[PDB]
Design a protein around this ligand. Structure first.
Ligand SMILES: NC(=O)c1ccc[n+]([C@@H]2O[C@H](COP(=O)([O-])OP(=O)(O)OC[C@H]3O[C@@H](n4cnc5c(N)ncnc54)[C@H](O)[C@@H]3O)[C@@H](O)[C@H]2O)c1
Ligand SMILES: NC(=O)c1ccc[n+]([C@@H]2O[C@H](COP(=O)([O-])OP(=O)(O)OC[C@H]3O[C@@H](n4cnc5c(N)ncnc54)[C@H](O)[C@@H]3O)[C@@H](O)[C@H]2O)c1
Ligand SMILES: NC(=O)c1ccc[n+]([C@@H]2O[C@H](COP(=O)([O-])OP(=O)(O)OC[C@H]3O[C@@H](n4cnc5c(N)ncnc54)[C@H](O)[C@@H]3O)[C@@H](O)[C@H]2O)c1
Ligand SMILES: [Cl-]
Ligand SMILES: [Cl-]
Ligand SMILES: [Cl-]
Lengths: 516, 516, 516
C-alpha cells in the first residue's frame, strides 16, 4: 500500500523513431561487447574458474557472444555454504525491507531494458519484440512478487480464537534452494523463479541454461547493484546433468524450482522424492514442463482473426515456447477456410538473423536444429507436409515455418513436443471431437478456441483441460498478474507464476499459542 | 455465510450424571455389537470379501470387537473405477451443495458421538475424555472444511484486469486419490483427511489403519446415511504394504494423503515422485509423520503448572500421539523442582482397562507393546530409569508411565519416536542450550515452553523450530481452526490441517481469458 | 485477531454464596497483611527508601492498612534513567509482543481480583460492588489497549502513492513520560494511564495518589510478575507537589498523563507548555480534570426510574467520582414528583464501614471530610438543606447523603466540584432552560437526561455539552470500549480513555520515502 498499484510493463513495438534509435544503439553496444567473460557470483562476489561455458550467436554461430565461468561440485558447495549462511539473517528481514529491495532491482532492470533486450537478440535469437516481451515480463515478476509478498507478512494467517489464549499463525521461509532455468525466456523465467522465493525470505542458487549464460550474468549484475546481501542470490552457470543434478540430489538443498523439459522434470521430481543421506526434510520440487498446445477453430469463428492468432502462436520465437500452438484442430467446416488462410500468412514470414528483426530468427542451437529437423523427417511419414520442412541457407540455425496436415491425433508429431516452427493440423468432425483430440495428449499447458458460439466457449472453459486457456486470441504471451501461468498433467506441478499463490509454495506455516 | 460461524465441538468431561449415564449406555450398546462384521464400501454399497480383518480389544486382546472385509488389488481397482466415475460429476457440484453434504454428515456424527467414543474406548484403548476429544475433532474437521471450501468457490482468484478482455482464474479439484490413515486418531484424522479433499470436489479411497478398522467402518456408515454420491468416498480396510502400497504406486491415483510413521511416509513420498507406467501427471503426496516433541522449562516458570502440563502431554493416550511430549528439557535452575513434581504426579497415574476411564489405558497392540518395551530396554543402556519401565499385570497391553533421566541429547531414546508412555529428561545449562537441544532432532512437529520470562517466550516463538508451539500449556490437543496442525523437517510436508490452506493442496488453478 | 473479541469483565454482584465467601476470604487475607511495607519499583526491582508513606483505613483511620517507600528527587532521577534506558529497546519490540505482555498482565490481575477489591475496600473505602467495578475496569483497560495497539502497528498510515517511489508512514512512541493518578479509582485509572502509553512503546514513571499507595503497589506486583522489562514501568509513590511537580517540570520528561483536580491540572498544563532548560521537545500533557455533572429530568420521564438513577449517580462511592451527579435539574412539572422520590430513596441509604458493604462508605480522608463539610456550610448559605448535611458517629469519615434545594445556578455549590455525597437541586421552567443551566458551568464531563420525549433527547444529544451523555440511566460507570470517557471545557483535554483514539496521543508519525 506504499507504492502504486501493479501495472504490466509495456512491451515495445519499435514503431517510433525514438524506440528504433534506442534499440539500434543498444544492439550496437552489445555486439561491440562480444567476447566478454562473466564469472560466477557466490557470496556477494564474482568468482572465476579455470573451465568456462561458451555462448554462441545462433544467427551466426562462429561468433561468441560471451563466455562465463563454469560451476562444478566445489562451487556448488561454496554457494550452498553462502546461501545457508545468508538465510540465517535474510529470513529475519522485515518483509517491507525485502520488498523494497526487489523494487530497487526492478527499477535498475527497467533502466537497462534495451541492453537486456539486445543481449537476448544475440544470445538466443529473439527478434526485437520477442526480446522486449521477455524483459518486460521479468520486470513484471519483480514488481508483482514484491507486492504479493506483503500479503504474507507476519502474522498473516486467519485463525479461530480461543478463550484465555493468544493463537498466532504465520509464514516462514524454507531455506536455501536451487533454481534451474530454461534458455527460451532466460531473463523472464530466470528472474521470476529466483525473486519469488527470495522475496519471502529464502535464498537461492541459480543455474542458468547453458545456451543463455550471458544474459543470466547480466541479470546478476542487476542483483548485485541492487544490493542483495551476500549469499542471498548466487549465480552458477554450468552443465545441467552435472552441477544441476548435484544440487537437486543434495541433502542440504531445501527446494527445487525448475522450468524445462519433461524429460528432465521427471528426473528432478523423482530425485526430490528421495531422502538423500543425512537429509532432514521432505524436499519441495516445483517442475513446470513442456506442452503440446492446441488451438481449436470451429465454423463460427472469424477465420481471418483465427489464422493470424494461429500464426503468431505457432511461429513466435520460432515456436520455442512452452505455450506455442503446435496443434491446430479444425472442425470440418473450418478446415479449408482456416488452413488456406494460415498457409497464406505463414508463407510470407521472413526468416533471418535476429538482429534484422525478422518474423523468425534461428532456433537456439545446433542440437535444437538437429532435433527439429529430425521431427520433420518423422512427420513426413505421419502426416502431409504442405509448407516448409527444410533448413534454410546460412550458417545460422534457420528453419522455415513448417506445416503438416491430415495429421493423425496419435502421431508422434501430434503428441511430442518439438519446440520448433512446426505446426500439425488435425481435421475433426465437430467441436466435441475437437475437445477430445485437444485433451488427448500427456500435457495440459495452454490451449485456445476461436469461435463465436457462446456455448462452445463456455463448454471449453469447463472441459478443455489446460492451465491457461484463451478465447479468440493468441495462446502465447501470458501476462504476469493477469493470467496466472502454469499447466496440468505432464506440463507440470501447476505452480502458477505471476499469481499470489506462487509465493505460498516457498513458505511453511508455524502456529504458536500462549495460554495466559 | 449461510450457517453460524464455526465453533469447536465441546469436549465432554463426564462431570454430570447424565453424561456418565449416556456413556455407560453407549459402551453397553457397542459391546453388544462386538460380533458385527463390516464390509468394504465401494461405489455407494457395502461389498463383502472372502478374507477378513480382525480387530481386538487392547484392554483384553482375547476379546474381538469386530471384523471387517479385507481389500486386495481387485477391490482397490473396483474402488478406483468407482472413484473416477464419481469424480466426473462430483467435481461439477456447486460448492454450496458439497458443503451442505458435509454439514449433514457432521450433524449425523454429532448425534452418534457417544457410540463413536465408546467404539474408540474398546477398539483402540482410549479413556473417556481422549475418546470424546477424538470424535469432537472429527466433527470439527467436517464443520471447518465445509465452510473453508466456500472460500475457494468459482471464481476465487484475484487477478489483474486487462483492456478488452475477461480474465478469470478459478480452482478445480484434482481427481481420485487415496487416504492412508493412522490408528491413534481413527475418527478425527481419518475423517479430516477424507472430507477435506472431498469437500472441494475430489473423490477418495480411504485405507484405515489395521488396528482401527471397525471405527473407520462406523464413520462410513455416517457418510452413507449422509448421502455422498456413489464412488465419492470408498472404504478399503486392508494391509498397508498390500492395498495401501498398490494405490500409492498406481498410475491412476492422483494424490496421496497420508498420516503415519516416518518410515512409511518416506517410502510413500519416494514412490509418489516416480512416474508409474502410463501415468499422466505429477502425483501430489502429503505426508504428516512422527515427532520427538520436547517441552522446555526454565527457572522462571510456574513449576506446578509445568509439571501438570508435562504429565498430560507425555502420558495422554499413553503417549501415542504425534504431538506427545517425549522429551523434557530442563535448565539447571528448573531441573530438581520440575523433575520432583513430574515424578510425584506421574506415580499417581492409574493404568488399566480403558472403559474404566483410567489415566492410561493399554497401548494399542502386541506389536506396539513389543516396540515400547524394546525402547525401554534401549533406554536402560542410555539413561537412568527412575519411574515405571514395566509391563503391568493383565492380558491387556498395560505399560506403566516411564521416566528416564540424565539422557544424552543424541541418545536413541532422545531421538527416535517411541510412541509410548516414555519420557526422556534432559538437563541443560541455560535457555540457549535448551533451544539447541530442542531443535537437534530430525523432527519438528510440536514443542512447548514453560517460562514467565517474556524474552524467552518470544525468542522461542522465532527459534524453536516446530510447526505447533505452545507456551505455558500442554503441547497436545491442537484444535481445528485455532491451531493449524502440521510440522517441519521429518515431521512431514507441513500440510496444515484445520486451516484454510489445507484445501488448496487438493486443487489446481485454471486461467481463462476471452478477448472480446 | 489472535485473541477473542474484546468483552468487558463482568462486575461481581455478590449475589451467590461462593462470591460472598470468596470476598470474606480476600478481606481476611488483606487485613492480615496490613503491616506490609511496599518499596518503590525502579528498573525492574523493588527499592526501599529511608522515609515512608502511611496509608490509613478511612473507615477506621487509627488503623494502618500499609506503608510504602517515599520517592524524592533522587528516586525520580533514577526512575528517569531507567525509563529512558528501557525505552531504547522497548520501542523496538514487535507490537504483537508488547500486546501479549499486556494480556498476560490482565490474566494475572483477573486471578487476583478479589484481593485487589478487598484492598480497595480497606484503603479507599469502596463498598463491595464499587470495588469490583474498579478492578473490572482496570482489567478492561489492559484487554482493550492490548488489542487497540495492534491497530497502529507498522506501517499503519494510509497514504497516497507516487510513481517510482515507496512512501511509508508509520507510528513511533514518544519516550519516557510520567503518569500522575487520583485516589478515587486507584486500580482502574492508575492502570489505564500506564498501560495505554506502554502498550505502544513508551515507558512510564507512575506516581500514585498519596491516599492509594498500597493498592498501587499491588498493581505493580502484577506488572512485575507479568515480566515487563526493567525500566518500562516504574512505581514512585510520593508527594504530588514534590516528586510529581519535579517530573512534570523536568526537561527529560516527554509527556504527562494526568487525572485529578482542576486546580492541579491547570498547573500541570501550564508547566507542560514551558521549555525547561535543555529541553528538546514540546511536551504533551493530557489532563482529565473534575466535573460538575447534572442530570436533567422533565415531566415526561419515568419518575421512579429517574429517582433511582439520580441516587446511584449522586451517592455511588460517596459522590467521589468525576462523573457523579452533583446537580439535579428539574423542570417544573418534574420537580415535586422527582424530588419526593429522590428524598425517599436517599434517606434509606446506609452509611458505615466499607467492608460491611453499606450503600455508602466513608469519604477517603480527614482532608476530604474537611472539604465536604466546608462546602456543606457554604451550601447552607446558598440553598436549603433538606437531607443529611452532617458527619456521622465514628472515627471513620462518614458523611450522610446530603441534598440542597432551591439552589441558584450560579451558587458555589452549583458550580464547584465538592466531590462528596452532596446533591444540589435546581428548579427550571422548561427543557430549554434546563439545558442552559446544565451547560452554564466551567465543566463538561458527564451529564444525563431522563425523558420519554424523543425530541428532548435528540436535542440534548446535540446541545448538552458534555463528553459523556446518558439517557434514562445513571451517568456514572462508563465502560471501557463502550463509552469513550473524557470531557470538554475545564473537565480536561478530551483524552478519551477506553477508545482507539487514546493510543494515538502517545505516538508520533514518521514518513519515509525512497525514490528507486
Ligand atoms: N512450463 C513452463 O512454464 C515452461 C516455460 C518455458 C520452457 N518450458 C520447457 O522448457 C523446455 C525448453 O528448455 P530447455 O531446453 O532449457 O530444457 P531442459 O530440460 O533441457 O533444461 C532445463 C534446465 O535444466 C538443466 N538440466 C538439464 N539436465 C539436467 C539434469 N539432469 N538435472 C538438473 N538440471 C538439468 C539445464 O542445464 C537447464 O538449466 C521445453 O520443454 C519447454 O516447453 C516450460
Ligand atoms: N503428523 C501427524 O499429524 C500425525 C498424526 C497422528 C499420527 N502420526 C504418526 O503416525 C504413526 C502412528 O500411526 P501408525 O502406527 O498407524 O503408522 P504407520 O506408518 O505404521 O501406518 C500408517 C498407515 O499406513 C499404512 N501403511 C503401512 N505400511 C504401508 C506401506 N508400505 N504403503 C502404504 N501404506 C502403508 C497402514 O496400514 C496405516 O493405514 C506415528 O509415527 C505418529 O507420530 C502423525
Ligand atoms: N476526568 C477524569 O477522568 C477524572 C477521573 C477521576 C478523578 N478525577 C478528578 O480527580 C480529582 C480527585 O483526585 P485527587 O484528589 O487525587 O486529585 P489531585 O489533583 O488533588 O491529585 C491528583 C494527583 O496529582 C498529584 N499532585 C498534587 N499536586 C500536584 C502538583 N502540584 N504537581 C503534580 N502532581 C500533583 C497527587 O499527589 C495525585 O497523584 C477530582 O477533581 C476528580 O473529579 C477526574
Ligand atoms: Cl479443466
Ligand atoms: Cl521456526
Ligand atoms: Cl456537544
Amino acid at each position: 500500500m506504499t507504492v502504486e498499484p501493479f501495472r504490466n510493463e509495456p512491451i515495445e513495438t519499435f514503431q517510433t523513431e525514438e524506440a528504433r534509435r534506442a534499440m539500434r544503439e543498444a544492439l550496437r553496444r552489445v555486439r561491440e561487447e562480444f567476447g566478454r567473460h562473466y564469472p560466477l557470483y557466490i557470496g556477494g562476489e564474482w568468482v572465476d574458474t579455470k573451465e568456462r561455458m561458451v555462448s554462441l550467436n545462433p544467427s551466426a554461430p562462429s561468433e561468441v557472444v560471451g563466455t562465463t565461468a563454469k560451476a562444478g561440485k566445489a562451487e556448488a558447495e561454496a554457494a550452498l555454504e553462502a546461501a545457508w549462511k545468508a538465510f540465517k539473517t535474510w529470513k529475519d528481514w522485515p518483509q517491507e525491507d525485502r520488498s523494497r529491495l526487489l523494487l530497487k532491482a526492478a527499477a535498475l532492470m527497467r533502466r537497462r531494458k534495451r541492453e537486456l533486450e539486445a543481449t537476448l537478440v544475440y544470445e538466443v535469437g529473439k527478434n526485437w519484440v520477442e526480446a522486449s516481451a521477455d524483459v518486460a515480463e521479468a520486470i513484471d515478476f519483480i514488481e508483482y512478487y514484491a507486492r504479493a509478498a506483503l500479503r504474507y507478512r507476519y502474522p498473516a494467517v486467519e485463525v479461530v480464537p480461543y478463550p484465555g489464549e493468544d493463537n498466532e499463525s504465520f509464514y516462514v521461509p524454507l531455506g536455501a534452494g536451487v533454481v534451474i532455468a530454461p534458455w527460451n525466456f532466460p531473463v523472464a523465467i530466470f528472474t521470476g523463479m529466483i525473486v519469488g522465493p527470495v522475496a519471502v525470505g529464502n535464498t537461492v542458487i541459480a543455474k542458468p541454461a547453458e545456451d543463455a549464460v550471458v544474459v543470466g550474468a547480466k541479470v546478476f549484475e542487476i542483483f548485485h547493484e541492487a544490493g542483495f546481501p551476500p549469499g542471498v542470490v548466487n549465480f552458477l552457470p554450468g552443465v545441467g546433468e552435472e552441477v544441476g543434478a548435484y544440487l537437486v540430489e543434495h541433502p542440504r538443498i531445501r527446494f527445487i524450482n525448475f522450468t524445462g523439459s519433461l524429460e528432465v522434470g521427471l528426473k528432478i521430481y523423482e530425485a526430490a522424492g528421495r531422502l538423500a543421506p543425512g537429509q532432514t526434510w521432505f524436499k519441495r520440487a516445483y517442475v513446470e514442463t513442456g506442452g503440446k498446445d492446441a488451438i481449436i477453430v470451429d465454423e463460427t469463428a472469424d477465420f481471418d482473426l483465427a489464422a493470424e492468432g494461429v500464426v503468431v502462436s505457432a511461429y513466435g520465437f520460432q515456436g520455442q515456447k512452452c505455450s506455442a500452438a503446435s496443434r491446430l484442430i479444425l472442425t470440418q467446416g473450418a478446415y479449408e477456410p482456416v488452413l488456406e488462410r494460415v498457409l497464406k500468412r505463414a508463407e510470407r514470414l521472413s526468416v533471418g538473423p535476429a538482429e534484422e528483426n525478422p518474423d523468425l530468427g534461428p532456433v537456439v542451437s545446433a542440437e535444437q536444429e538437429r532435433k527439429v529437423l529430425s521431427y520433420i523427417e518423422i512427420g513426413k511419414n505421419e502426416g502431409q507436409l504442405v509448407l516448409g520442412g527444410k533448413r534454410l541457407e546460412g550458417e545460422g540455425y534457420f528453419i522455415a515455418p513448417t506445416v503438416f496436415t491430415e495429421v493423425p491425433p496419435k502421431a508422434r508429431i501430434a503428441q511430442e513436443e518439438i519446440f520448433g516452427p512446426v505446426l500439425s493440423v488435425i481435421r475433426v468432425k465437430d467441436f466435441a471431437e475437437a475437445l477430445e483430440v485437444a485433451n488427448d495428449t500427456p500435457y495440459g499447458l495452454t490451449g485456445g478456441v476461436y469461435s463465436r458460439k457462446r456455448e462452445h466457449l463456455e463448454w471449453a472453459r469447463r472441459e478443455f483441460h489446460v492451465g491457461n486457456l484463451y478465447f479468440n486470441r493468441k495462446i502465447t504471451g501470458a501476462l504476469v498478474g493477469v493470467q496466472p501461468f502454469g499447466g496440468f498433467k505432464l506440463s507440470g506441478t501447476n505452480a502458477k507464476t505471476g499469481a499470489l499463490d506462487y509465493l505460498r509454495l516457498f513458505l511453511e506455516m508455524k502456529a504458536v499459542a500462549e495460554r495466559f
